[PDB]
Structure formats: structure tokens, C-alpha cells
């Protein structure tokens, strides 16, 4: 009887002082996506070709227009809005701490060495559940409107295994690790 109710974010205002953080994390997200592709032998080219391993976004984040940068900034703002709607605190407290291929070579920092406390891991789980509920509500509405069938992910988040949760968990964890790496103190208040 899955009724996904993600937290309301539409009227949530992100403080302007977080814009630099949003930009840094968007570039990081791009660099990580680009790194994985370039190491999997993908390269720049006008078209998105699965066979020839080519993608037009395999270029520096600096070369993207502001509207194009929204491919990355938009999901980041949505995450931040959810954290703000829950009255979590996000405050800067510290200083913001392989084969070289042909052309673009992004070297993003490794977030495997960034450790999350029990509290931040619980917070990542709450963000992950919200990603599941956001997608779930959107999917349920799409299927209802477009007369579609069903989907195995249209079930409560707490009925999923650790592996089924991994994608949303890793997205939430990457955000809290980057926040921590950049000197932000994040709490549930």
C-alpha cells in the first residue's frame, strides 16, 4: 500500500552563502562521472555513441553554460532543500580542505578516505529514503497519468535490501562526505 510522501521542497529557499558549495559539488559530480567514463575508454565527440565510446559532455565543467550546469546543480539543490525542510543545520566550520588519456583528464578527489560518523550515516539513510520517495511519487503519478503498469521499486524504502538501497545511499553519502571534506558541520539539530 505504497504512498510515497517525500518532504515538501518547492517553497524551500537555499541561503545564497551555499551557492559556492553547490558549484564545487556540481563540478565534483561532473569530474567523477567524466573520470569513470574516460577510464572506461570514453572520449569527447559531437554524439552520444555507446559503440564508439563517445559523449559531448566529456569536457571541462568550465566549458558548460550556466543552464547546462543545471544538469548537476538541480539534483544538488533538491538534496539541500530536503535537508533545510528537515531543519538540519549546514554551517562552514573549517577550511575547505591510472593512465593520462588524450585531452580532458579530470582527477576528482577520492571520497573513500572520508569517514562519516554514525550520525551522518543515519542522515545519509534519511536522504536516500527521500530520493526513493521523490522518485516513487513521480513514478506513481507518471504511471497513473500514462495508464502504465507497475514497477518493483514502488514499495516502501524500509522493505529494500542493503544492495537495493546502495544507489540512493551512495548518492546521499557522496554529498555528506563532500560537505565534510569542504569544512561543513552538518547536524539533524
UniProtKB/Swiss-Prot annotation:
Signal peptide: none annotated. It is found in: Sarcoplasmic reticulum membrane. Detected in skeletal muscle (at protein level). Fast- or slow-twitch skeletal muscle. Sequence repeats lie at residues 1-97, 98-189. The N-terminus is blocked. Channel activity is modulated by phosphorylation. Binding of [3H]ryanodine indicates that the heterozygous channel is activated by Ca(2+) concentrations 4-fold lower than normal. Single-cell analysis of cotransfected cells shows a significantly increased resting cytoplasmic Ca(2+) level and a significantly reduced luminal Ca(2+) level. Homotetramer. Can also form heterotetramers with RYR2. Identified in a complex composed of RYR1, PDE4D, PKA, FKBP1A and protein phosphatase 1 (PP1). Repeated very high-level exercise decreases interaction with PDE4D and protein phosphatase 1 (PP1). Interacts with CALM; CALM with bound calcium inhibits the RYR1 channel activity. Interacts with S100A1. Interacts with FKBP1A; this stabilizes the closed conformation of the channel. Interacts with CACNA1S; interaction with CACNA1S is important for activation of the RYR1 channel. Interacts with CACNB1. The calcium release channel activity resides in the C-terminal region while the remaining part of the protein constitutes the 'foot' structure spanning the junctional gap between the sarcoplasmic reticulum (SR) and the T-tubule. Pore opening is mediated via the cytoplasmic calcium-binding domains that mediate a small rotation of the channel-forming transmembrane regions that then leads to channel opening. Belongs to the ryanodine receptor (TC 1.A.3.1) family. RYR1 subfamily. Cytosolic calcium-activated calcium channel that mediates the release of Ca(2+) from the sarcoplasmic reticulum into the cytosol and thereby plays a key role in triggering muscle contraction following depolarization of T-tubules. Repeated very high-level exercise increases the open probability of the channel and leads to Ca(2+) leaking into the cytoplasm. Can also mediate the release of Ca(2+) from intracellular stores in neurons, and may thereby promote prolonged Ca(2+) signaling in the brain. Required for normal embryonic development of muscle fibers and skeletal muscle. This is Ryanodine receptor 1. The chain holds residues 2734 to 2940 of 5037 of the full protein.
Amino acid at each position: 500500500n505504497f504512498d510515497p510522501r517525500p518532504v515538501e521542497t518547492l517553497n524551500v529557499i537555499i541561503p545564497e552563502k551555499l551557492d559556492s558549495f553547490i558549484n564545487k559539488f556540481a563540478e565534483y559530480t561532473h569530474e567523477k562521472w567524466a573520470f569513470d567514463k574516460i577510464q572506461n575508454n570514453w572520449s569527447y565527440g559531437e554524439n552520444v555513441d555507446e559503440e564508439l565510446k563517445t559523449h559531448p559532455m566529456l569536457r571541462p565543467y568550465k566549458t558548460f553554460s550556466e543552464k547546462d550546469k543545471e544538469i548537476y546543480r538541480w539534483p544538488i539543490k533538491e538534496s539541500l532543500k530536503a535537508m533545510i525542510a528537515w531543519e538540519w543545520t549546514i554551517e562552514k566550520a573549517r577550511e575547505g580542505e591510472y593512465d593520462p588519456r588524450e585531452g580532458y583528464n579530470p582527477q576528482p578527489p577520492d571520497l573513500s578516505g572520508v569517514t562519516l560518523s554514525r550520525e551522518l550515516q543515519a542522515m545519509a539513510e534519511q536522504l536516500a529514503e527521500n530520493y526513493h520517495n521523490t522518485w516513487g511519487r513521480k513514478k506513481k503519478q507518471e504511471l497513473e497519468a500514462k495508464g502504465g503498469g507497475t514497477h518493483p521499486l514502488l514499495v516502501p524504502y524500509d522493505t529494500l535490501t542493503a544492495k537495493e538501497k546502495a544507489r540512493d545511499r551512495e548518492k546521499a553519502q557522496e554529498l555528506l562526505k563532500f560537505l565534510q571534506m569542504n569544512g561543513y558541520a552538518v547536524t539533524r539539530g
